[PDB]
From a paper:
FliL, a component protein of the flagellar motor, is known to enhance the motor performance under high-load conditions in some bacteria. A flagellar protein, FliL, which is a single-transmembrane protein with a large periplasmic region and associates with the flagellar basal body, has been found to be important for the function of the motor under high-load conditions, such as the highly viscous environments in some species. Polar FliL is composed of an N-terminal short cytoplasmic region (residues 1 to 17), a single transmembrane region (TM) (residues 18 to 40), and a periplasmic region (FliLPeri) (residues 41 to 167). FliLPeri shows a remarkable structural similarity to the stomatin/prohibitin/flotillin/HflK/C (SPFH) domain of stomatin family proteins, some of which are involved in modulation of ion channel activities in various organisms.
The FliLPeri crystal belongs to the space group of P42212 and contains 20 molecules in an asymmetric unit. FliLPeri is 17 residues longer at its N terminus than FliLC, but these residues are invisible in the electron density map of FliLPeri. Therefore, we determined the structure of FliLPeri with the same region as that of FliLC. FliLPeri forms a head-to-head stack of two decameric rings in the crystal asymmetric unit. FliLPeri forms a ring assembly in the crystal with an inner diameter of around 8 nm, which is comparable to the size of the stator unit. The bean-shaped subunits are vertically arranged in a parallel manner in the ring. The N terminus locates near the ring-to-ring interface and points toward the outer side of the ring. The C terminus of each subunit is arranged on the inner surface of the ring on the opposite side of the ring-to-ring interface. The side-by-side subunit interaction in the ring is primarily hydrophobic. The subunit interface is formed by characteristic hydrophobic belts on both sides of the subunit along the longitudinal direction of the molecule.
Numbering used by the authors:
A (entry chain F), E (entry chain J), F (entry chain A), G (entry chain B), I (entry chain D), J (entry chain E), ...: 60 to 167
B (entry chain G), C (entry chain H), D (entry chain I), H (entry chain C), K (entry chain K), L (entry chain T), ...: 61 to 167
Write the structure that this text describes.
């Protein structure tokens, strides 16, 4: 009965440009948020516009050398998850989420 | 430090880059982050004016402010201060706290 | 002063510029900024005249004016002063305060 | 005179130019600015005749009357008198006051 | 001519082809009927299938250079009106229409 | 003698391939029947399949020059009327229709 | 009585390829049945799947010579009718249709 | 001399048979002609077995047999005897009399 | 002695690539399960996701030459039906199906 | 006492890239979860976002010779299963699934 | 001779007849039997006149006439004559042949 | 002379007439019979005036007139002359020919 | 002989019968039994005439006949013979074989 | 001499008048009769004021006026002049020509 | 020994039986049990005749049989054997095996 | 401003008043007559407060006032002055000109 | 000088009060009048608590109060100050300014 | 500063009878819950079938004079709250709700 | 222990109990409170057996028990043990933990 895991769905997928090597490509990322506790579930859901901002800002600084690599995608989640906590810690004083989950990842 | 509230701007801003031979379009989906139930009421009512302040900021953005991480973050700080200055002249008070970009593509 | 109100012109304006290089289509979305319930009523009831006035204003602009930041700002001002000068000759009062552009593409 | 009224012609006037080196289509969307409660009634009833007078005006228009800013204004003036002359010869009254162009593109 | 004016709509536009220079075009004309009197308005609707045919037989005998000229267009509209009157006089003995109105005219 | 005119709709659009010379051009013909008399009206409706068959039989001999001259179209339209009669005249003993009308005629 | 005319509709058009052919040309025939009598109409409807089978056989055996000559169609409508009668004569012991009718015919 | 019944197979049989230089696609729409009421009840229940037997028969044919009308006749008889043999080993009864073809295209 | 035959449907159309991609082709298969007894019919429906999995595993080894020869197609049908039995033999302890039936087989 | 089999569907099909050798290739895997027990069935549904994230992190690290060889997917399913069990063990403390099934696999 | 055709009058005729104990509410549903396609056309278009002549006929019926078979055959054969005379004055043709009673309650 | 046309009055007439003891409730469904397309056009357009003349005539009729079929015909011709006299004063034309009763109950 | 066919008469029959202490409603739902494909064609087309010959027959039956089992059997044959005598006068053929009663209530 | 137009008042007027032995529920359905498009435009817009003037005139009449045929005629001429006097103080113009009664029940 | 199959009769049976004080209202919902695929085909096609033989049998039953449990078994068997006699004369075959009662109420 | 506007109150005003014999319902349908576009904006926005001032006024009405034509006029004039008093205390402006009663039934 | 806003409570308050002769069903529909966008937010969120304090006040009132125009005001003020007492204990703010009654009946 | 207030709606009204001195008067109560904290809002919604039971057991024990007296309803309100807290302390271990609210209360 | 779950029973239990003067209805709305994810599946799948065991317990209780607050508590505890006894005999598990009554009227 310790703080139960809950998943806040970010329904709108993230399309963005990768700063690629002379290749104009689009990356589509469908993500969700893993939280623990009820008041974190309603906080991450209520502040989802700010969370959608932290993710899109993180995905821009990601290189195609970092997206194509499996190890880079793992490091991408860590940096994307930490960037949300830094923004929420400054806005509401709480690190609401505990990690962000990628459920779809294509490079079109 | 009133509770935070987010005002949505539904129409995504579709505009073209600053003078490029390969004519590409920019699509930005934005929202407003306000503090206070009164500012939220003001941010919704004057949102047509806020949308114009965002376009005047986007249409004057350089290529660096569209393809660089530091450039995009500056454009966010650029667009926010433009809105505060525009609303400070219309209603006498800066309504928003900052602008939020939830989608940003160049195609 | 009377409270600020906005009148939305829902249909976007598509028009050809008098360009000399190639064929060009420009799409502009606009709303009206008025003050007072009296002018807000007139702005809606005379939207056909206002939609007509904006189209005649845009058609005279060249592409270089659309890319220069001052060209757009002086086009918005020229568009606003034309609607006022047109509604002054139809009802006797400059209904609107200024024209607001919320989206702008050259394609 | 009487308060102004606007009669909408929902038919979009699509026609082709006397193309210099290629075929090209023009799309015109027009309304009717009339003064009076009886003129508004007359303009809406005889809108087929009014729509016919506009097609005859557009089909006889040069390319200068279509792509020039001054000539496009001339096309509006000539189109108004064609309707006045038609309705005066049909009902005895020049029902409309002037024709308004809400959309004017050349694909 | 003393009766009030009425307008009978022909809702289906007229698609036909005319002999071009060497390639035939495809002309589309949206037309309406102008009548005077409730009796002529009554007949113009009931006999519209015959009126639709008399216009098609008129447009079939048209050429492109006749279409791209003010006189050739006015000649065509006036000829299309007399042909219907001749057709309806032969059927019901009354030229129920005053003239044919052209509301839209494209040629592609 | 002079019965009230009635128009019977043949809803099927006649698409057929004219024996083109330059290329294989299609033909789209939409027809309606002009009859006089209430008995002829329901006879034309009940025998519409037979009347449509008589229209395809006469269109099978149509050449390209047949469908492009206005004199040849009237020549064809008259052959369509007299053939529909002869078919119905030998099937039900009565020439049912008066004329056949063409309300849509394109070639492309 | 007089064995009144009756028409049984075959709603789906017949699409098949001409035999031979330089290429593999497609043709589309929309057919109906013209039966005589109230009992033959019931038989023609209930036995339509077999009647549709008898038409595919007759259709898929026609030459491009036969499908483009206007008299070749006549020799085909009669061949389609005689084949259905022979088929139904062995199925139910009665010739049912007395003829078949074409309402649309294209050679794409 | 039991009553004749027609069991319909809605989904048309789309398959491919290799020619000389073609990835040739064939479409066949078929129905089942049965005799008696018990077989009509059995032909509907055992349709997946019947549809499978038909697909197995068509795949074994060559484009030569699909061209010649005689070859198509011995394709119905080969499809019928295959269906009967398939139902004999499953329910001990040849359920159908003959399989009918209503559509046959090759493009 | 003979249990009643039942047919369990698999509405999923199996789409997969031919393994030999020197000739890059795509094949679509629609299958149905043939079982006996009401208990096996109940089992085949409940374990359909497992049965769908065994078919995909069988379709992975199918060679392009095996998909073309009809003797190889029945070699694949008699193999895919055995793999399903082996799969269900290990999961629930009894071979649920009798054979797999193919109702659509195209190589696009 | 026994734990009957239960299948937990994942309706979202997985779309990703291979890091292809010749060019960028698109893959589509449609998966389902095969659990045992009633508590695990509801655990598999509630933690679907975490499970879908683990399958994506597994499919991304897979190569082309894995996705084109039959046993390469056999190794992929095991790695897909073991990664989910390791993820859920750190999150909820139980290896919920015990295996993952593939019902559709296309590398286009 | 001029094949029989039936023209349906969907309006169920509702009218009152004066009895002795209480007022009687009669309800009649009728049709029209005509011969010839032209008389069938006239019977439909002149239905408001035919419905009028049936009400005038049924309103004069005594309660003893309704509760009597020979009285209803008298009323049935009388309403037909009253329609033939009504249409002879309007179009000069005895359109119908007879009137059919399909339902008859008196309650 | 001219073709007969029937203009239907969809809204039935409900009113009250005083008998001996109670106040009665009458329900009349009426249709107009005209000759000529001109009069059919006027009877439809001037229907509210026609619906007023019928109510002005019905409420002035007694129960002994509504009950007597010989006197009920007098009401039909009385209502017709009242409409003709009314329309002769509004448009100078006796538009209708006669009023028709298609349903008549006396509750 | 000829194939049996049943022609449904969906509009059920509702009529009164003269009792002693009350007028009782009678609701009969009937169908037609025909033999041959042509009689079925006539029974449907001449259905309004057939529905009339039943109302003339049903209304002439006393309560002592409707309650009796034998009374219903003779009424059925009487209603059947009445239709044949009616259709022999109209189209010279006795179309039906016998009338069937599928519902019989007396209230 | 302007063309006649009719303005419909949809919401019926339900009011009370007090007679002997009971109250009275009166229900009047009315339409306006105007001449000219300007009056037609004014009558529709000022209907809430017109509905009030009718209710103010209706609720002030005695039961002997609603029951008398001549009493209703003078009520129309009284209700009409009360509207003209009301609209003379509102917009300085008597808008209507007369009021019409299309349904008049009294319970 | 053919497989069992049930043919439904959806519309229940309503009929009257004579009791001591009143007429008792009986409602019977019934189905048919047949053996064989062909008999099931005839049972549905000859439902109007089977519905006739059932109502003809139910009318011959009294209250002391319906309220008696053993009196309903002989009724179920009488209704069954009476149907077989009706179909032995109609189609030369006894179609059903026996009739089934699923719902049964009185009064 | 000069132009008259009507603000509608769609809620029915149902309330009770104690009479000389029994409690009495009242149903009043009211609308607001304002002058000017700015007043129309306040009247719609402050309808909850205005609806309260009407109920607070109608609650104090006596049965002899609602039935007296002079009383309703005084009540109508008192309900308007009460509304102007409430809006003067809330927004500092007397928004409405008068209150209009379109439907009034006491019962 | 804060803007006024109205928070509606849709579910009308139905409660019972004990009278001299029987119980009386009182039905009150209320709205909330607040000043400030912040107080409008709390009034909506805490409406379940506000609907409770109103019933805790309404159900504790007498019939002599609800029939008194003065006591009805003292109730409206008692309910207004009772809500401030609860919200000053829940969130420490007098969220509302007063309560409004839009309908007040006693059944 | 304890926790933000939240309201959990019990949309099903409570209907029950009480034995009056003359009749069996019917009561109708529509209730809601006031909780503080996001977890208590989550628990009160999930355990609503238990909370609705603790109200019916409490309401059914109340007399008729206890309902008409406003001082008795405040006692019934504060009593129904403690009966829920004791029920949830034994069920889940937390006094989830803070107090019960009454939005509608009639007697018949 | 295992987590708590609630298995709803949508069938409201309607039955009768024998009172001293008449038979009083009883309406009990019940739900199942299970502990364990497996028990939830068993409780849902065995609802027909559970609904059977509840009615066997409800239809056996007396009126003095259903009206007793303490008598209802031991009814809830007895109906709970009745389900556990039945499910232990069928599946060898006491699936439920206790029954919950959500609504309980007797009327």
């Amino acid at each position: 009965d310790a703080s139960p895991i809950a998943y806040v769905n970010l329904p709108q997928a993230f399309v963005f440009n990768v700063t690629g090597d002379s290749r104009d490509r689009l990356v589509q990322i469908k993500a969700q948020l893993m939280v623990r506790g009820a008041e974190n579930e309603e906080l991450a859901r209520y502040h989802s516009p700010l969370i959608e901002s932290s993710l899109l800002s993180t995905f821009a600084s990601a290189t195609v050398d970092q997206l194509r690599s499996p190890t880079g995608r793992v490091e991408l989640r860590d940096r994307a998850s930490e960037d949300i906590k830094a923004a929420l810690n400054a806005a509401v004083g709480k690190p609401v989420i505990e990690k962000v989950l990628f459920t779809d990842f294509v490079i079109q």
